[PDB]
Symmetry: C2
Subunit: 205 residues, 2 copies
């Protein structure tokens, strides 16, 4: 038939999976009645769930969220199946793939098949980040709450920030077949922030 | 040829326009810094800036993991130039327009040309709302923070919601020409709320 749209965003609620299970990282909803009209507020970490990372996050004085051009967050992307991988995605895991200057690449891993936080999530290794940066992709997305662990200094993030790559974290990709999509990765229009929650959709156009 | 995306969303920051200028309505960012690392929370009204308000039956009996559904927030819409209207849009302002069952319609008015909150915003009046509800459109968007004022009991919202219409408020339509668009109205995926901030994009597709 016609166009399929996939929503690859994690739902936000108190008790959701958060980073290292830290209970300070949980969102809080608050209400207030008196008469006729909802009130309600949401208090949340900007690195909650599915979200897009501003350079400010790992860089002092670093580039800030509204600085991300929408026009990179909208357009063709490639989704690769890396679910057979263990521990982490290396250079040698991705070097044979069709990845090029300008591409937005998304990596489905084992992470998408887990619903709670796991400390040993599949991440993007330093060698792989370098290879990607040197290739000059425009964007990379992963399906863990963070794109790096176990790497003193957070080199993966910085390799990628230095080379102008956008990072999307927290994606949920279990239901999406490998291949090409048109992506709309649509964040809250936060000004001056280290990241933002994003509602991400993939269209098979 | 060549696709244009129009961002029609207001930015979110402390000091931004909010309904009736009430300070309670402002968002607050709070930050902590740990060396190289910088991490933020955002505390905001779910009705901040550009936002969706959906009929209560769409988020259905508890929280569940239920969120405002996207079937109608993502797809074709009609945008109408009603910048000639004064005070309020009435039945007679829109009855001749090409509006049909299932449509999502967006109204560009004088509000688009004001950046601050104005108390006497152009709104949708009862009679126009009833016309649309009875027509069984799927959605209506307006470019003030509220779609209604000066109507005791909120008959505008009431009648739209009975008919299952979704409302978008806080659009920014100044730069967008009358016509047809593919809309992606992408809300924060907050479980169990009938309203949420959103990032709204129009493609000329
Ligand atoms: Zn991160
Ligand atoms: Zn409303």
């Amino acid at each position: 038939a016609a166009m399929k749209v996939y929503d690859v965003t994690a739902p936000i609620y108190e008790g959701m999976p958060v980073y290292k299970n830290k209970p300070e990282k949980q969102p809080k909803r608050t209400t207030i009645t008196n008469g006729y009209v909802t009130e309600s507020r949401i208090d949340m970490d900007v690195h909650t769930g599915t979200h897009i990372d501003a350079p400010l996050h790992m860089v002092e004085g670093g580039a800030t969220f509204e600085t991300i051009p929408l026009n990179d967050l909208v357009g063709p992307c490639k989704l690769f199946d890396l679910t057979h991988v263990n521990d982490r995605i290396t250079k040698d895991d991705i070097a044979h793939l069709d990845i090029q200057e300008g591409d937005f690449v998304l990596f489905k891993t084992k992470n998408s098949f887990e619903d709670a936080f796991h400390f040993e999530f599949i991440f993007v290794a330093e060698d792989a980040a370098r290879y990607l940066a040197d290739k000059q992709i425009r964007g990379v997305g992963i399906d863990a709450l963070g794109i790096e662990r176990a790497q003193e200094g957070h080199p993966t993030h910085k390799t990628l920030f230095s080379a102008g790559v956008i990072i999307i974290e927290g994606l949920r990709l279990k239901d999406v077949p490998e291949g090409r999509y048109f992506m709309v990765a649509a964040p809250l229009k936060l000004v001056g922030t280290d990241a933002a929650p994003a509602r991400v959709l993939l269209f098979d156009r």
